[PDB]
Design a protein around this ligand. Structure first.
Ligand SMILES: COc1cc(-c2nn(C3CCN(C4CCOCC4)CC3)c3ncnc(N)c23)ccc1NC(=O)c1cc2ccccc2n1C
Ligand SMILES: [Ca+2]
Ligand SMILES: [Ca+2]
Length: 428
């Protein structure tokens, strides 16, 4: 008899899912992935619940201040998000000391402004004050800072997680959709804001029948669906009948290119723009570690959510179906590799730092190609640190093997303002 408890309120929207309130307990009947069959102890109804909305009873996940499976950089991002203040905090799984926990606290440094400090929890942080439960640790630090940079106030604001997609609804009838608004149109099809079965806002890409094969196209979509990651747009479903429709999550702020050029985008200071680049590097490191290639990396194929999370779009599409973002080897010989993506990434970094200015402004494709062969590279723009420019330059090496890895770029971008020795605080 396995009893789970609700972390968030949920409102049913399908045929057989269950509504529940935060605090409601349920008995688990089947653990079938994204959706579990359960019986609500409150309503006595049997049905499907999102497995990410619940936790085992008495689990640390049930605590308002506990955040499971979250990295150091993820914790900084969640803590600096709108809704928090001095002393906002989380306990989380330690990223580097497997099996242990870490404490992250919102602080303010006179020079840098809002920062997040990290403390290893050993429970105790400092030998002087020992605690039996994590709850006890937390309770102490809320009334006076016993050597912490800032005393604990309220736990980090938790967002309600995205509903998983309907169960066993990877291939859907066209009838399930209403395409309400055309957002974009081009060579290979259109993108539409849409609703799936009344309840869910989605984005739909429509494909023009092409050189492509209907069956060959679906095999790629079918693999891409399995290559899931927090920094890759979520693939939800496909309509298999021509013309093929691809259904993804809807990204409220559209593309990064349009976002950067908007009034809101032009208000993002440099540290924010570096954080975007670091999110994109993290998606490309995942693609690199899996041994794939994107092949069409630029700001037009990055999407931004309402909370300013950046995600890579069209991973998969360019492998099925812009010379200013392309490495010279790939232009010259069609050698697309992860190294030619690293080149494109350098260009995208410059796009980000110049708020979506076109690369090589006032030069044509032919001029760019001839210039590059000469050793020309775009110069450092005005609001760009020297060290960010040196990253770009490493991305733009003529020899692809001399270009950094995404794993390495990601690590440099994530901690761009933080000395290594300083990732964790030290209290004797
Ligand atoms: C529904 O599928 C997609 C949708 C989008 C998408 N584009 N836009 C907007 C962004 C800016 N434009 C501009 C045009 C010029 O004017 C200014 C606006 C308007 C649209 C969005 N806005 C919100 N949410 C979205 N999801 C999108 C991008 C890629 C895919 N598809 C894939 O990622 C994909 C296809 C695919 C095929 C095969 C295998 C895998 C595959 N994948 C992962
Ligand atoms: Ca595109
Ligand atoms: Ca340290």
């Amino acid at each position: 008899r396995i009893i789970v408890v609700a972390l968030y309120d949920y409102e049913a929207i399908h045929h057989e899912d269950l509504s529940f309130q935060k605090g409601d307990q349920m008995v688990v009947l089947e653990e079938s992935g994204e959706w579990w069959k359960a019986r609500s102890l409150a309503t006595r109804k049997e049905g499907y619940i999102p497995s990410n909305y619940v936790a085992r009873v008495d689990s640390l996940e049930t605590e308002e201040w506990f955040f499971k499976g979250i990295s150091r950089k993820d914790a900084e991002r969640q803590l600096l998000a709108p809704g928090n203040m001095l002393g906002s905090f989380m306990i989380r799984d330690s990223e580097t000391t497997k099996g242990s926990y870490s404490l992250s606290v919102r602080d303010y440094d006179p020079r840098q402004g809002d920062t997040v400090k990290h403390y290893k929890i050993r429970f105790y942080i400092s030998p002087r004050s020992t605690f039996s439960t994590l709850q006890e640790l937390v309770d102490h630090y809320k009334k006076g800072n016993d050597g912490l940079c800032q005393k604990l106030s309220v736990p980090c604001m938790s967002s309600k997680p995205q509903k998983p997609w309907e169960k066993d609804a990877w291939e859907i009838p066209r009838e399930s959709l209403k395409l309400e608004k055309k957002l974009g149109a081009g060579q290979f099809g259109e993108v539409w804001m849409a609703t799936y079965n009344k309840h869910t806002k989605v984005a739909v890409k429509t494909m023009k029948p092409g050189s492509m094969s209907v069956e060959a196209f679906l095999a790629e979509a079918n693999v891409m669906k399995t290559l899931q990651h927090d920094k890759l747009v979520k693939l939800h479903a496909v309509v298999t009948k021509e013309p093929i429709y691809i259904i993804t999550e809807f990204m409220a702020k559209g593309s990064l290119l349009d976002f950067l050029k908007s009034d809101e985008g032009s208000k993002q200071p440099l540290p924010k723009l570096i954080d975007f680049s670091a999110q994109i590097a993290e998606g490309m490191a995942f693609i690199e570690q899996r041994n794939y290639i994107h092949r069409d990396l630029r700001a037009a194929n990055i999407l931004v959510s309402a909370s300013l999370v950046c995600k890579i779009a069209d991973f998969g599409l360019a492998r099925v179906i812009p010379i200013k973002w392309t490495a010279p080897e790939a232009i010259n010989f069609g050698s697309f590799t992860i190294k030619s993506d690293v080149w494109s990434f350098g260009i995208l970094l410059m796009e980000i730092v110049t708020y979506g200015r076109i690369p090589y402004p006032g030069m044509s494709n032919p001029e760019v190609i001839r210039a590059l062969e000469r050793g020309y590279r775009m110069p450092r723009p005005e609001n760009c640190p020297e060290e960010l420019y040196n990253i770009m330059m490493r991305c733009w090496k003529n020899r692809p093997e001399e270009r950094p890895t995404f794993e390495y770029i990601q690590s440099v971008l994530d901690d761009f303002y933080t000395a290594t020795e300083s990732q964790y605080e030290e209290i004797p």
